[PDB]
């Protein structure tokens, strides 16, 4: 398959707005560009490394949520019922335990969060 984070990198307003009208999500978001998505992903992993380490050694959970907080826009979001495009500064990455990877996990997806 593909890397689902790519559904949330550099998307147009048109694309995101289509997901919240025809699609069935309450909101849809996208990182500004690849450099930003990569930078946010790395910072979120590094600032949650203790949480990831506990998750890998002790947890039977299928996935782990790791959140990123900042005060600088890293992307855009739209919500059902409106065409307003919001700049957003926070993000969420979802990982899954994957013993075959060097870190022990794979990134399932990630995107900005209002």
């Amino acid at each position: 398959g593909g890397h689902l984070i790519d559904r949330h990198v550099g998307k147009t307003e048109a694309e995101l707005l289509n997901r919240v009208s025809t699609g069935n999500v309450k909101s849809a978001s996208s990182f500004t560009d690849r450099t930003t998505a990569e930078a946010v992903t790395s910072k979120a992993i590094d600032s949650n490394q203790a949480k990831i380490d506990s998750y890998l050694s002790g947890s039977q959970k299928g996935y782990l949520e790791i959140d990123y907080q900042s005060n600088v826009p890293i992307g855009i979001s739209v919500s059902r019922g409106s065409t307003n495009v919001s700049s957003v500064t926070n993000a969420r990455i979802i990982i899954a335990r994957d013993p075959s990877m060097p870190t022990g996990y794979k990134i399932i997806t990630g995107y900005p969060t209002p």
């Binding site: 999500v25 309450k26 978001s29 959970k61 996935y63 969420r92």
Partner: protein, 99 residues
């Protein structure tokens, strides 16, 4: 406090499973629930069900329960297009967990 500190089990379902990509990862909302059931332990889903019960027992105004599910717990699936109320969708999730 922050809501996911006290409702972590529902936050986990709603943020990790009902992520923006749920249709591509798992399929429709019930196929998503089935993937959760198959993947996670019995203890995990029983603690998630307990959180549903804490919500249902309050008989909240629907607008408040919807704000909790969609905005505070941050579910990406817009269940109101399939469900008349947030109570009814939660009762459905609960039932989907059974045998």
């Amino acid at each position: 406090m922050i809501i996911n500190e006290k409702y972590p089990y529902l936050s986990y379902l709603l943020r990790c499973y009902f992520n923006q990509d749920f249709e591509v990862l798992f399929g429709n909302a019930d196929e998503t629930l089935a993937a959760y059931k198959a993947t996670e332990t019995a203890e995990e889903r029983l603690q998630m069900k307990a959180e549903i019960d804490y919500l249902l027992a309050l008989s909240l105004p629907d607008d408040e329960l919807q704000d909790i599910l969609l905005n505070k717990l941050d579910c990406s699936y817009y269940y109101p297009n399939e469900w008349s109320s947030s109570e009814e969708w939660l009762k459905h999730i609960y039932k989907q967990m059974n045998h």
